[PDB]
Design an enzyme around this catalytic site. Sequence first.
Site, PDB file in Angstrom:
ATOM      1  N   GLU A 223       0.803  -1.223   0.000  1.00  0.00           N
ATOM      2  CA  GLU A 223       0.000   0.000   0.000  1.00  0.00           C
ATOM      3  C   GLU A 223       0.845   1.287   0.000  1.00  0.00           C
ATOM      4  O   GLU A 223       0.464   2.289  -0.618  1.00  0.00           O
ATOM      5  CB  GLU A 223      -0.975  -0.018   1.184  1.00  0.00           C
ATOM      6  CG  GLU A 223      -1.955  -1.186   1.123  1.00  0.00           C
ATOM      7  CD  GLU A 223      -2.813  -1.170  -0.138  1.00  0.00           C
ATOM      8  OE1 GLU A 223      -3.213  -2.257  -0.593  1.00  0.00           O
ATOM      9  OE2 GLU A 223      -3.094  -0.074  -0.671  1.00  0.00           O
ATOM     10  N   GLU A 261      -1.940  -2.241 -10.351  1.00  0.00           N
ATOM     11  CA  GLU A 261      -1.647  -3.371  -9.480  1.00  0.00           C
ATOM     12  C   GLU A 261      -0.497  -4.243  -9.964  1.00  0.00           C
ATOM     13  O   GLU A 261       0.327  -4.674  -9.162  1.00  0.00           O
ATOM     14  CB  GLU A 261      -2.897  -4.235  -9.272  1.00  0.00           C
ATOM     15  CG  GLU A 261      -3.998  -3.569  -8.411  1.00  0.00           C
ATOM     16  CD  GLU A 261      -3.581  -3.315  -6.971  1.00  0.00           C
ATOM     17  OE1 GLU A 261      -2.476  -3.764  -6.557  1.00  0.00           O
ATOM     18  OE2 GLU A 261      -4.369  -2.666  -6.243  1.00  0.00           O
TER      19      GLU A 261
HETATM   20 ZN   LIG Z   1      -2.794  -3.022  -4.597  1.00  0.00          ZN
END
Ligand SMILES: [Zn+2]
Length: 416
Positions: A223, A261
């Site tokens: 994160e 991502e």
């Molecule tokens: Zn992520």
Amino acid sequence: PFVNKQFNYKDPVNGVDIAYIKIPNAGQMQPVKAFKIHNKIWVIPERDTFTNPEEGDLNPPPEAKQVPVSYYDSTYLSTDNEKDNYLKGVTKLFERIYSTDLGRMLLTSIVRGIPFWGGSTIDTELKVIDTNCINVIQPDGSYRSEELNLVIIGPSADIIQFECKSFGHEVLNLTRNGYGSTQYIRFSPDFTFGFEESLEVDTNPLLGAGKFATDPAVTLAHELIHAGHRLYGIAINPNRVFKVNTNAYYEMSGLEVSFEELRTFGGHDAKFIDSLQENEFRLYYYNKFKDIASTLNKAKSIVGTTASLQYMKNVFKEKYLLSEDTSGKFSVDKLKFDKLYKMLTEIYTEDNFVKFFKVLNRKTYLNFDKAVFKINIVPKVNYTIYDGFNLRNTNLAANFNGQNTEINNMNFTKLK
Ligand SMILES: [Zn+2]
């Protein structure tokens, strides 16, 4: 990063690094106790019922996803003891991250990533964007505005739905225009996820594969990486995706993962990113940095107090690694840019953090064998800054025994 003072949730407020605060968001929310663990970084041990107006209650909704995918408990993080344990857990993870050269680098980039002052409607005046600050209560009850780059906060209704979010602008796309915005990471150090590893020859003749647990320090670093992309306004719109499976099915039923991502996870799955796409964005953000340097040059006035236009231009000179001539003009140094850009998008990856931590982690982004566990990282006998769950000088030191949910069962309570 390095948290110098040890914090106890019950420590008395001081209006400096321990105080009740209000988040810009909206609504006359009641202030919440927060702790400043490092310059520009605060931790709020409360469930996040503030960042999104449509996410205010913690009860599982009708149609909620089941256990492995989601987990609900409206009472989690509601007592002082839980908040104290949450605070210490988050702090310990920051130290573990900071203990690696990569984490120290990432945390430094994050502290330098001050959200740009492109608020004012007068292109010749610099003004801080309100949603990039918090309001800190003073002894008399009035509020003082303070700029920050990162906030670690408790999850919303779905306890295991971790994500880096921020307040949007009416017209500016702050995380994708080079400006950046204060990041709020919904996160919990009290739970972790499982994955199945082929630690047995990689080729196993259909036998019970080990059930391992993800190291929370890896999850948090993941994160913080999104946070870094977002703080420098170079995140990739979530709508931009790539297929990883093979072929697709009706209604785009193909296994696709967002660009954001894949680059963040890194490693193997990064190959699914189209190189042309990568270059297009690299250049796109190059121009964004330029526009920022230009705005700094064509700037005259500034709003605020303890900050001078000159002082701020220098702050952004440092963040965007701008070049300053004798006359005082700013310009984007292509070599400096490529260095910073690669750092934020290629060096800072979950994959690399896994290498510095020497832990076991799932090999691919999509996890088809999920599991959830209740954990407690605070007690030294359970987890340390340097070894995580795999404590040296214990039978948990080798073969990632510490992360093995069956071998180190006392540290992982299966939630189903
Ligand atoms: Zn992520």
